[PDB]
C-alpha cells in the first residue's frame, strides 16, 4: 500500500492527524502524507476526515491543495497530497526585515480569491483560513490547505457549528452568536490576511472573544443599526459595548494604495450581505496589473 | 448567498447524475426486496426522530444505501447493518453533534456488535469511494422555496413531507432524479395548499415544465392519496408534529389540473 512511499520528515499537525513529507520511489514525486489513526477511535472514521476527503475529491483547482490518493488499512488512513514548500506564516517571518513585495501580495491575494470562489461555487465553506493553512511553492503559487474544519452548505444555509475559525481571523457575526453564517466568514478571514501580508502583523490579535470584538470595533467603529441592520438584536450583542468611532483606512494599513484600501474595506464590511464575494473581488481594480512573481524561497 | 445560488444549482444538477443509484438494482438482489427496503427506510425515519436528526441526514443515508446496494449483494439479515452504518456516516457528514457509535449499536437492539457497525462503516466508505457529498431532494426543495411569493410554511412542510414519502418506495422513485422529485413535491404542495402552480421563475431556473414533471407528479399524487393505507407510517406520524405544521393532516386533492 505504502510500499512505494519513503518518509522524509514530519511537517506538522493540523486540525487532525499528522502530516509528513514523503516520496514516491517509483515516480520520484514528493508528496505530503496525512496519517489518520482509526484504532484511536472506536468511534471509527472521524467526521473531519469524512468531510475533508469527500469535499476535496470534488474540489480540483490550481489554488486548492490537491488530494492525490486515499490509502486504507483497518488501522490507518493515509491521504496523499501534492507537496508544497512552506506556509505563508513562515514566509512572512522570513520576510520580516525586507518586507513582502506588493506584486507578490497582490498575486497571492488574487490566487486565494480564485481558490475561495471555487470553494464557494461548489457549496463548500473552508472555516479556518489563516496563514498556517495557506501553502506556497517555489513557482509563485499559493493554495488553500487543511480542509478538516470545512463543510458542505445548503442554500439557504442553516445553523452550523459555532466553534469555528481561529480567533484572530473570526468574523463578527460568529463572535456575536448569529444563528446563520455563510461564505462571508471566509472573506472576513481573507481580509485579515491581506492586511497581515502588508504590515506583517495580525490585524486583530485578540486574547478572548470579547477582546477580539473590541479590537475589531476600535479599528472599524462599533457597529450600529445604520451600518449593520439587526446588530443590536444579535444574541451576544450588549448595549453596554463601548461605542468607538471608525478609523479611516489609510491609518489601518498605511502602505496600501487607494485601490487596496477600497478592496480591504469591502472584505471587512460588517454586514455579511454587503461584504464582497470572492467572485466579485477578482474584478476589483486593485488587480488590474496583477502578475505572478516567483518568491525568494529559503527552504 | 444569492451570488453563488446559480453556480451551486448547476453544480448539484451535475452531481445528482453521478450519485444516481442503479434503477433496476432490487431485481438483482437475490435475498432483499423493495418491501424490505421500505421497512428499513421507515425505521431510519424513526431513528432520525428519536435522535432529533436533520432531514438532510436521512436523505443522505438513503442515497448511501441505494448506491451501496447498487453494487453489493446483501442478505436480509444484514440489511439493517448497512442502514445503520449509512445513518452513522450521514450523521458524521451532516450533523453538528452526531450520535456516538454506541447509540447506533443500541438502536439496532444488539442485533449487531459495535465492531460490526464500524467495519460496515468502512466497507460503505470503500464502496462509495468516499463520495458522500450527494445532492438530495431536500437540497433542491430548499432552493425552490426561495421562489415563493410570499413564503408559506405549510407549503414548505408539505413539500418536505412528500419528498420524504418518496424515499420509502424504490419502485417507482429510484428512476427519478432528486431535482425532479423536488419539482413534483413543490408543485403538488403548492397546489394542495394555495391552488397555485409550478412558477415561471422555476421554469427559468430548472428548465422543468409541468409537462416534464408530469410522470413523477402522477406517481407522487398516487403515493399521497394512498399514504394513509401504506404499510409504512412513520413519516405520516412525524409530520403531525407542530414543528412541521401538522401537514400530514391536510387532505390531498382528488385530482390535478392538466
Ligand atoms: C512549519 C513547516 S513549513 O512551513 O516549512 C512547511 C509547511 C507545509 C509544507 N507542505 C505541506 N504541508 C501540508 O500540511 C501541513 C500542515 C498544514 C496545516 C498546519 C499544520 C501543517 C500539506 N497538505 C497538503 N500538502 C501539504 N504540503 C512544507 C513545509
Numbering used by the authors:
A (entry chain A): 0 to 298
B (entry chain B): 175 to 432
Authors' account:
During G1 phase, CDK2 bound to cyclin E mediates phosphorylation of the retinoblastoma tumor suppressor protein (Rb), which results in activation of members of the E2F family of transcription factors, thereby assisting entry into S phase. We present biochemical and structural studies that confirm 6-(cyclohexylmethoxy)-N-(4-(vinylsulfonyl)phenyl)-9H-purin-2-amine (NU6300) as the first example of an irreversible inhibitor of CDK2.
To confirm this conclusion, NU6300 was co-crystallized with CDK2/cyclin A and the structure was resolved to 2.4 Å resolution. As has been previously observed within this inhibitor series, the purine ring makes a triplet of conserved hydrogen bonds with the backbone amide and carbonyl groups of Glu81 and the backbone carbonyl of Leu83 within the CDK2 hinge. The aniline moiety adopts a similar pose to that previously observed in the CDK2/NU6102 co-complex, packing against CDK2 through a π-π interaction with the peptide backbone between Asn85 and Asp86, thus positioning one of the sulfone oxygens to interact with the side chain of Asp86 (Davies et al., 2002). As a result, the vinyl moiety can react with the side-chain ε-amino group of Lys89. The structure of the CDK2/cyclin A/NU6300 complex reveals the inhibitor binding mode within the ATP binding site and confirms that the vinyl sulfone forms a covalent bond to the ε-amino group of Lys89. We identify the site of covalent modification as Lys89, a residue that lies just outside the CDK2 ATP binding cleft and is not well conserved across the protein kinase family. Furthermore, this structure suggests how the reactive moiety could be grafted onto other CDK2-selective pharmacophores to develop inhibitors that specifically target CDK2.
